[PDB]
Each structure stands twice: as C-alpha cells, then as structure tokens.
Design a protein around this ligand. Sequence first.
Ligand SMILES: Nc1ncnc2c1ncn2[C@@H]1O[C@H](COP(=O)(O)OP(=O)(O)OC[C@H]2O[C@@H](O)[C@H](O)[C@@H]2O)[C@@H](O)[C@H]1O
Ligand SMILES: [Zn+2]
Length: 274
Amino acid sequence: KGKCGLPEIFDPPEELERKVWELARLVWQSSSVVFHTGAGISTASGIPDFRGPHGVWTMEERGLAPKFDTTFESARPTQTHMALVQLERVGLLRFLVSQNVDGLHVRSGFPRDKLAELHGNMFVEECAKCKTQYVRDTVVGTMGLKATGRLCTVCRGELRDTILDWEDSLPDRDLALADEASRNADLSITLGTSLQIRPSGNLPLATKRRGGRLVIVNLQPTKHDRHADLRIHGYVDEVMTRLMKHLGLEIPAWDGPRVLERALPPLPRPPTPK
Ligand SMILES: Nc1ncnc2c1ncn2[C@@H]1O[C@H](COP(=O)(O)OP(=O)(O)OC[C@H]2O[C@@H](O)[C@H](O)[C@@H]2O)[C@@H](O)[C@H]1O
Ligand SMILES: [Zn+2]
C-alpha cells in the first residue's frame, strides 16, 4: 500500500545542526506541541518499518519477509521514545498521536491519557461489552479485532485485540483526542512516518491549516513534504538527542515495561533562550 522503497536523504552535519536549532526554537515558542509518530521511530530497536528500503511492503514487493531483530516483548524503547516521555514530563509535549502497534510508547511509561494509538496496540485487548482496555505484558495473540479467548474481569464480556484490519475504522476516542490536539496545536512534529495513511497522515496538516507550524522528520520523502515549515532528513534518535541537548533536558533511562494511565502536572524545566 502506497509508495515503497524511495531513496533516503541525510542532511549533512551542519545542515542538520542548523535545522535542529530551528526546531528547538519552534518548540520554545509554541505553547501546544503535538507529536505524530510512525514506524520509523522503532527501527533502531529492531522493528522493521513498512515502506523503507527493507520495510514490510518494500520487501513483500521482492518476495522477501520482513526481518525483526527483536520480539515485540523484548523490544526496548529507543532514545526517541524516551525523549518523548521526558518532553511530556516537563510540559513541552501536549499530546502524542501514534500509528504504531508495537506498544513501545505505553511500555516506555508515556501517559496513556495523552496518547492516541490510531491503529491499535499489540499488547492491548478491549471488552466488547464494557469497552475497558487491558494492557498486557505480552502480545495479545490476535489481530483484526478478534476474540482473544479471554473474558473481562470488571462483566465476563468477550475480550478482543485492538489491531485494526485493512477495512476497520479507527477507534472513536483516540481519533477524537488526536483531532482535538492537532487542530488546536501551535506546532505539529512528525517523526518516522511517511504520512501516506488517512486520516492519520493528514492530522499534522490540520495544525498547518489552523495557522500552526509543521515539522517533518523523516529519512525518505513524505506525502506532505511541501506543507512543512522545516523538513529534517536524519535518524530520529540523532535528531532527538540533539534537540534534547539544546533544550537542556536529560533523556531518562528505561527501567523495563511500565504503564502510566494519567499524566502529572509539568516537572521543572530550564528557562527559554533569548
Ligand atoms: N531511524 C529513523 N529515523 C528517521 N526516519 C526513519 C527511521 N527509520 C525509518 N524512517 C522513515 O520512517 C518512515 C516510516 O514510514 P512507513 O514505513 O510508511 O510507516 P508509517 O508511516 O508508520 O505507516 C503508517 C501505517 O501504514 C500501515 O501499513 C500501518 O498501519 C502503519 O501504522 C519511512 O519513510 C522511513 O524512511
Ligand atoms: Zn467488560
């Protein structure tokens, strides 16, 4: 599905630094910062993307299977995952919209009330009856919104996976929160997504339409490149490491899988430059 296997682009060191300083500036000056993440933020942990050079669909085109260097369970959040945890803690991230099913945002300790997982989460099952969600320690075992073989404990209703199939519509609440955050954002930053899937890929444009700024961080071209105020071509982990340095923020260490349901008030953060 969509455009697969396009050549990657790398801003050279001085181009990159200048662009990351510009991004820092946009973050400092924007009250509402919304991040939009795709499969590219998980490749540095061993999970292949879909449309990159060895992406799932690109490889399918060659009659090759995708290569994982991890199970979903033994996957570690990347520096990028952890940077987003910290940005949220200090109040420099309003909301996070993800297209990833890998479960890494949740397991990194990102508060679920500021997270929309538009395409589902491998570790989450949902009661058909009450709609209460269960975050599990291991992948649920089914995809396509199917019965997992477990009953709810809030009820005895049927538990199903939340992995959307091709024809399946997006979770009502997640999309509602994603829309609200994107329309009301001063700044949308996309990370490691080619922005080819609607409505997910068009959400960062709602920010642009409403007068806000748009930053696209990606190794390949994306569908909405022409609409961005800043395009940054580099490994996300590098882009984020440099950004956090400029912002004067530590990237916290991951202590293993942890679920946080609700965000706290912002922690102290350094003062803004002149
Ligand atoms: N370390 C990295 N740093 C920066 N960019 C990266 C990195 N690794 C990969 N990328 C880029 O990330 C992008 C990932 O885009 P896709 O593979 O299309 O993944 P995504 O946009 O998340 O896909 C959207 C949706 O498509 C469906 O197949 C599936 O439902 C998925 O959630 C690619 O353009 C690739 O160049
Ligand atoms: Zn129930």
